[PDB]
Design a protein around this nucleic acid. Structure first.
Ligand SMILES: [Cl-]
Ligand SMILES: [Cl-]
Ligand SMILES: [K+]
Ligand SMILES: [Mg+2]
Ligand SMILES: [Mg+2]
Ligand SMILES: [Mg+2]
Ligand SMILES: [Mg+2]
Ligand SMILES: [Mg+2]
Ligand SMILES: [Mg+2]
Ligand SMILES: [Mg+2]
Ligand SMILES: [Mg+2]
Ligand SMILES: [Mg+2]
Ligand SMILES: [Mg+2]
Ligand code: NA
Ligand code: NA
Ligand code: NA
Ligand code: NA
Ligand code: NA
Ligand code: NA
Ligand code: NA
Ligand code: NA
Ligand code: NA
Ligand code: NA
Ligand code: NA
Ligand code: NA
Ligand code: NA
Lengths: 56, 194, 65, 46, 81, 119
RNA sequence: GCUUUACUGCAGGCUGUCGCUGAG
RNA sequence: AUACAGGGUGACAACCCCGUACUCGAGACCAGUACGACGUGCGGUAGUGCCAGAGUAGCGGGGGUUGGAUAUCCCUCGCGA
RNA sequence: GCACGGAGGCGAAGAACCAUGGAUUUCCGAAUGAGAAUCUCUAACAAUUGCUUCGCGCAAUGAGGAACCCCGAGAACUGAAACAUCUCAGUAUCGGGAGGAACAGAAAACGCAAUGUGAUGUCGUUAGUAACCGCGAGUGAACGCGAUACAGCCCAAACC
């Protein structure tokens, strides 16, 4: 089976959803954790120093 | 004449001698059956506490903390590293055990602030320290002229910033002269080389 | 406009509440007429009805009811 | 699929945000809805 | 405080329910239960509500289909507004 | 318990606590482990009281030997609050010292004997 | 990337010692 | 013109308009600081071995860190005034 | 309101507009009664603490913030024309947290050795000096001095 086009058909599962906290469509409804703000994992908001250049 | 306290002090100079020697063998059994952080009504070292700033007052708390002995509980590298950094067993943390204790005790009491601390012995694998913590919100402390300084907003979470007793000592801040070049006024400001 | 602040404070706690429920009904009937594509509108009012109501509520709080 | 009461609400908003700039605004501004979304060509969130 | 009734839902189909079945359709706040819609309706139009069917609309509001007792007349109650 | 080397029968203790109350009214008494320590050192102590429910025991551990090398007599009390109450305090008391009895120099002296005999 | 009696180190296993640790 | 800074105005504007110099007013910070005042009482002589912070000072095993070399600062295991 | 349409309205009962103060301020959110993709289920400081009338009665914490600050964890490419110590560098990045600034701070100091200096930051200089280093490549202070600003105190104990 092609990993390409034919394997794309079975994709009707829902994972990432509108986030109650941040409003971004990153709330993984299966993990109940947001990949964008970290809602469901961290009380504090997900944030990293590498989201920008070292000296900025 | 000698203060009664002077005798407690005197017995803790050689904790493995005389009566205190037998007390420890006693307690340490009940101690190993207690939690990591246990609040206690009275300091086991009264001269020690009082000497550190303890009072028999409302808003003052003391607690015993158990921490493991030894070096760092460090995971081995999962990626590239030069031999110098492939180290695991001989790596020890840069923050002494007394200081971990003070912290674990502080977190257990979110509203309290660490005043000071002292060791109360250790066995083969624990290390115990009793920590003195003050309620900066309780009047009686807010109204005490020798403690109210800890109430100031600028003191929020002292331990976590190394403003504690053992915090500053561990920070290499003891000497005011030779040897404290990269220590004072702060490690971080000195490029962290101390 | 047709209902001033003085006049509102010259009411008794009960008059304000009487007046409030009055405005609410005028407004509700305004929205029904609007909901029926009704043209006999006069837009300056359905807007005045909202502000009036807000004044009445505002005074009620100030006066203690 | 089975939608919730919240979900239904947003889909509703989106359908509304999918209208065109009223003819009177053209006149009033002396002269484009950049958020026009087609059900087939585009994809909403959730 | 939010009010239960928002305004009457007048459409062709709302007319037929009215003329043919003595029903009044309203645009209510979605947090309102069939109970709250019933009472609010009776108190506002001084009528007897027999039944209340509701639907959360693709418009973001909640529609309510209220039937009045044979004793009241929908066509009339709606005519005065 | 580690500083306690002999058991004081309930009754003896009562006469002791009784003797203590008349002392505070008729004679002199020191309340508190520090003051009491200063009595034994200074020699102005005649009979010293030591509670047995003191925790941490460090607070009293020294009384015994200190007392013996100062010839001063001492008696054990079970409850810390009783010795407090008996001393006239609203709080408890780890130790107390009868600095010159009062209208009990007799009873007192004999308690000191009774204990000396209690080994 | 892989291999080994290539070079240098690291975990881990075995073993002596010290602490926990006491009586005859 | 104590005003020839800058802008606007149907084209190059000190004098068309805003403003600009001059003078004046207000809020904020300085700061619950400086000054002032209230209370407290500083200091000196002689005598007195009454008091003055311990797993510390110090040594040893192993690391880290530093310019710190024997002579940086720190951790950990043992010993210890 | 941006926003110059249409209709209609508000302003001398002084609107617009601006300043200060006040009212209102849905739901989710540290999110705190419980569960949930912003909704639902049947009184709530959930959790961890302090005081405690031992009743959540009175309080604290939690999250955010442009960077700055403090305490911990800590690479590799790279340089050495290879490369291991060394270097990049306590850098990137990670964990915990403070404030409007942090941190430091009134000597068990300095040691131009003196009949001298006199808390601490920071700035200039001392100096690419002293010191380190497959003594290779590289790394690298301090005292003092000239300045800025200045400020000196509280316990523990003895004796009560
Ligand atoms: Cl703290
Ligand atoms: Cl000098
Ligand atoms: K390297
Ligand atoms: Mg593939
Ligand atoms: Mg700084
Ligand atoms: Mg449509
Ligand atoms: Mg239904
Ligand atoms: Mg290095
Ligand atoms: Mg909840
Ligand atoms: Mg190279
Ligand atoms: Mg070379
Ligand atoms: Mg370097
Ligand atoms: Mg120097
Ligand atoms: Na705390
Ligand atoms: Na260092
Ligand atoms: Na689509
Ligand atoms: Na509507
Ligand atoms: Na390969
Ligand atoms: Na060592
Ligand atoms: Na508001
Ligand atoms: Na709270
Ligand atoms: Na409570
Ligand atoms: Na090269
Ligand atoms: Na190479
Ligand atoms: Na080297
Ligand atoms: Na000079």
């Amino acid at each position: 089976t092609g990993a390409g086009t034919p394997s794309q058909g079975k994709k009707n599962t829902t994972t990432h959803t509108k986030c109650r906290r941040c409003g971004e469509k990153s709330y993984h409804t299966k993990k109940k954790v947001c990949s964008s703000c970290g809602f469901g994992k961290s009380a504090k908001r997900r944030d990293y120093e590498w989201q920008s250049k070292a000296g900025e | 004449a000698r203060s009664a306290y002077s005798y407690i002090r005197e017995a803790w100079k050689r904790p493995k001698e005389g009566q205190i020697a037998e007390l420890m063998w006693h307690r340490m059994q009940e101690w190993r059956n207690e939690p990591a952080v246990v609040r206690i009504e009275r300091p086991t070292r009264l001269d020690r506490a009082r000497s550190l700033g303890y009072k028999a007052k409302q808003g003052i708390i003391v607690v015993r903390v158990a921490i493991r002995k030894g070096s760092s509980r460090r995971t081995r590298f999962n990626k590239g590293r030069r031999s110098k950094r492939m180290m695991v067993n001989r790596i020890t943390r840069k923050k002494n055990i007394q200081r971990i204790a003070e912290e674990r005790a502080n977190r257990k009491f979110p509203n309290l602030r660490v005043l000071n601390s002292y060791s109360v012995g250790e066995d083969g694998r624990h290390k115990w320290h009793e920590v003195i913590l003050i309620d900066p919100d309780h009047p009686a402390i807010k109204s005490d002229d020798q403690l109210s300084w800890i109430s100031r907003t600028r003191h929020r979470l002292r331990t976590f910033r190394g403003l504690t007793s053992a915090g500053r000592r561990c920070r290499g801040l003891r000497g005011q002269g030779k040897g404290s070049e990269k220590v004072r006024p702060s490690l971080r400001v000195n490029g962290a080389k101390a | 406009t047709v209902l001033h602040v003085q006049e509102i404070r010259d009411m008794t706690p009960a008059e304000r509440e009487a007046e409030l429920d009055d405005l609410k009904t005028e407004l509700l009937n305004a929205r029904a007429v609007q909901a029926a594509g009704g043209a006999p509108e006069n837009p300056g009012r359905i807007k005045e009805l909202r502000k009036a109501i807000a004044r009445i509520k505002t005074i009620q709080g100030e006066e203690g009811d | 699929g089975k939608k919730s009461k919240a979900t239904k609400k947003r889909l509703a908003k989106l359908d509304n945000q999918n209208s065109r700039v009223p003819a009177w605004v053209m006149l009033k501004t002396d002269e484009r809805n950049h958020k026009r979304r087609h059900w087939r060509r585009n994809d909403t969130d959730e | 405080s939010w009010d239960v009734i928002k305004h009457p839902h007048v459409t062709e189909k709302a007319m037929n329910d009215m003329d043919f079945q003595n029903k009044l359709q309203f645009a209510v706040d979605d947090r309102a239960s069939k109970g709250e819609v019933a009472d609010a309706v009776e108190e506002q139009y001084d009528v007897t509500v027999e039944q209340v069917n509701t639907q959360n609309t693709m418009d973001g509001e909640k529609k309510a289909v209220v039937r009045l007792s044979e004793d009241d007349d929908a066509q009339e109650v709606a005519s005065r507004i | 318990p580690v500083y306690v080397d002999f058991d004081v029968p309930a009754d003896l203790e009562d006469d002791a606590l009784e003797a203590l109350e008349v002392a505070r009214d008729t004679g002199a008494v020191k309340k508190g482990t520090n003051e009491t320590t200063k009595s034994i050192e200074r020699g102005s102590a005649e009979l010293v009281f030591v509670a047995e429910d003191v925790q941490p025991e460090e607070i009293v551990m020294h009384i015994p030997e200190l007392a013996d090398e100062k010839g001063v007599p001492f008696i054990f009390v079970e409850q810390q609050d009783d010795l407090g109450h008996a001393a006239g305090l609203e709080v408890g008391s780890a130790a107390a010292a009868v600095t010159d009895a009062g209208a009990a120099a007799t009873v007192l002296e004999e308690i000191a004997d009774k204990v000396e005999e209690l080994r």
